[PDB]
Amino acid sequence: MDFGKPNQVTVNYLDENNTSIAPSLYLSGLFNEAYNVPMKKIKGYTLLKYDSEILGVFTESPQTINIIYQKKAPEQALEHHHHHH
């Protein structure tokens, strides 16, 4: 069983509501390669945080990296509407 198994890393550019504001980036490099994480400053956001699991090698299964960019604009023009779903 080695068919249908990509070694690509799924990089997600998350906003805040766990929504990716950019199409999930399929990082495709060499197999067992130690890669770098592609980062882009979207709309002037500050990198909120990413998960510690980034430094390693392209695995035999699609790895998922959550890269979150937080709005560096204060909660004056930004409204968080809290409701019970």
JSON list of C-alpha atoms in Angstrom, two decimals, residues 11-68:
[
{"chain": "A", "resi": 11, "resn": "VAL", "atom": "CA", "xyz": [-0.17, 24.50, 5.26]},
{"chain": "A", "resi": 12, "resn": "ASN", "atom": "CA", "xyz": [-3.27, 26.38, 6.39]},
{"chain": "A", "resi": 13, "resn": "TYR", "atom": "CA", "xyz": [-3.26, 30.15, 6.74]},
{"chain": "A", "resi": 14, "resn": "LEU", "atom": "CA", "xyz": [-5.76, 30.63, 9.54]},
{"chain": "A", "resi": 15, "resn": "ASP", "atom": "CA", "xyz": [-7.36, 33.95, 10.43]},
{"chain": "A", "resi": 16, "resn": "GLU", "atom": "CA", "xyz": [-8.85, 33.69, 13.90]},
{"chain": "A", "resi": 17, "resn": "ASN", "atom": "CA", "xyz": [-12.14, 31.82, 13.68]},
{"chain": "A", "resi": 18, "resn": "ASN", "atom": "CA", "xyz": [-10.09, 28.78, 12.60]},
{"chain": "A", "resi": 19, "resn": "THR", "atom": "CA", "xyz": [-10.89, 29.74, 9.03]},
{"chain": "A", "resi": 20, "resn": "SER", "atom": "CA", "xyz": [-8.19, 29.72, 6.37]},
{"chain": "A", "resi": 21, "resn": "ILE", "atom": "CA", "xyz": [-8.19, 33.05, 4.53]},
{"chain": "A", "resi": 22, "resn": "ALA", "atom": "CA", "xyz": [-5.96, 31.52, 1.89]},
{"chain": "A", "resi": 23, "resn": "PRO", "atom": "CA", "xyz": [-6.34, 28.22, -0.04]},
{"chain": "A", "resi": 24, "resn": "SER", "atom": "CA", "xyz": [-4.53, 25.43, 1.83]},
{"chain": "A", "resi": 25, "resn": "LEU", "atom": "CA", "xyz": [-0.96, 25.32, 0.58]},
{"chain": "A", "resi": 26, "resn": "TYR", "atom": "CA", "xyz": [0.33, 21.90, -0.37]},
{"chain": "A", "resi": 27, "resn": "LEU", "atom": "CA", "xyz": [4.02, 22.13, 0.43]},
{"chain": "A", "resi": 28, "resn": "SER", "atom": "CA", "xyz": [5.64, 19.62, -1.88]},
{"chain": "A", "resi": 29, "resn": "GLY", "atom": "CA", "xyz": [9.36, 19.10, -1.54]},
{"chain": "A", "resi": 30, "resn": "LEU", "atom": "CA", "xyz": [11.69, 16.12, -1.41]},
{"chain": "A", "resi": 31, "resn": "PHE", "atom": "CA", "xyz": [10.92, 12.97, 0.55]},
{"chain": "A", "resi": 32, "resn": "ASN", "atom": "CA", "xyz": [12.44, 12.89, 4.05]},
{"chain": "A", "resi": 33, "resn": "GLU", "atom": "CA", "xyz": [13.55, 16.48, 3.47]},
{"chain": "A", "resi": 34, "resn": "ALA", "atom": "CA", "xyz": [13.83, 19.01, 6.29]},
{"chain": "A", "resi": 35, "resn": "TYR", "atom": "CA", "xyz": [11.78, 21.90, 4.93]},
{"chain": "A", "resi": 36, "resn": "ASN", "atom": "CA", "xyz": [11.05, 25.52, 5.76]},
{"chain": "A", "resi": 37, "resn": "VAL", "atom": "CA", "xyz": [7.61, 26.95, 6.46]},
{"chain": "A", "resi": 38, "resn": "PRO", "atom": "CA", "xyz": [6.30, 29.36, 3.77]},
{"chain": "A", "resi": 39, "resn": "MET", "atom": "CA", "xyz": [4.88, 32.45, 5.44]},
{"chain": "A", "resi": 40, "resn": "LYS", "atom": "CA", "xyz": [3.04, 35.42, 3.96]},
{"chain": "A", "resi": 41, "resn": "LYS", "atom": "CA", "xyz": [1.90, 38.60, 5.68]},
{"chain": "A", "resi": 42, "resn": "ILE", "atom": "CA", "xyz": [-1.72, 38.72, 4.60]},
{"chain": "A", "resi": 43, "resn": "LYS", "atom": "CA", "xyz": [-3.43, 42.12, 4.92]},
{"chain": "A", "resi": 44, "resn": "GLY", "atom": "CA", "xyz": [-0.87, 43.12, 7.51]},
{"chain": "A", "resi": 45, "resn": "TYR", "atom": "CA", "xyz": [-1.63, 40.46, 10.10]},
{"chain": "A", "resi": 46, "resn": "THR", "atom": "CA", "xyz": [0.67, 39.43, 12.93]},
{"chain": "A", "resi": 47, "resn": "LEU", "atom": "CA", "xyz": [1.62, 35.77, 13.21]},
{"chain": "A", "resi": 48, "resn": "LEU", "atom": "CA", "xyz": [-0.53, 34.69, 16.13]},
{"chain": "A", "resi": 49, "resn": "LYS", "atom": "CA", "xyz": [1.09, 31.29, 16.49]},
{"chain": "A", "resi": 50, "resn": "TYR", "atom": "CA", "xyz": [1.85, 28.02, 14.75]},
{"chain": "A", "resi": 51, "resn": "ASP", "atom": "CA", "xyz": [2.16, 24.53, 16.21]},
{"chain": "A", "resi": 52, "resn": "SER", "atom": "CA", "xyz": [5.54, 23.29, 17.39]},
{"chain": "A", "resi": 53, "resn": "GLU", "atom": "CA", "xyz": [5.46, 20.39, 14.92]},
{"chain": "A", "resi": 54, "resn": "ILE", "atom": "CA", "xyz": [7.00, 21.97, 11.83]},
{"chain": "A", "resi": 55, "resn": "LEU", "atom": "CA", "xyz": [10.69, 21.07, 11.94]},
{"chain": "A", "resi": 56, "resn": "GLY", "atom": "CA", "xyz": [11.19, 17.53, 10.74]},
{"chain": "A", "resi": 57, "resn": "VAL", "atom": "CA", "xyz": [10.97, 15.71, 7.43]},
{"chain": "A", "resi": 58, "resn": "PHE", "atom": "CA", "xyz": [8.34, 15.27, 4.72]},
{"chain": "A", "resi": 59, "resn": "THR", "atom": "CA", "xyz": [6.49, 12.27, 6.11]},
{"chain": "A", "resi": 60, "resn": "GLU", "atom": "CA", "xyz": [4.78, 9.34, 4.38]},
{"chain": "A", "resi": 61, "resn": "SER", "atom": "CA", "xyz": [1.45, 10.87, 5.29]},
{"chain": "A", "resi": 62, "resn": "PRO", "atom": "CA", "xyz": [0.06, 14.40, 4.62]},
{"chain": "A", "resi": 63, "resn": "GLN", "atom": "CA", "xyz": [1.15, 16.56, 7.56]},
{"chain": "A", "resi": 64, "resn": "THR", "atom": "CA", "xyz": [-1.04, 19.48, 8.60]},
{"chain": "A", "resi": 65, "resn": "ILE", "atom": "CA", "xyz": [0.46, 22.77, 9.78]},
{"chain": "A", "resi": 66, "resn": "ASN", "atom": "CA", "xyz": [-1.76, 25.43, 11.31]},
{"chain": "A", "resi": 67, "resn": "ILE", "atom": "CA", "xyz": [-0.28, 28.88, 10.75]},
{"chain": "A", "resi": 68, "resn": "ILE", "atom": "CA", "xyz": [-2.52, 31.51, 12.31]}
]
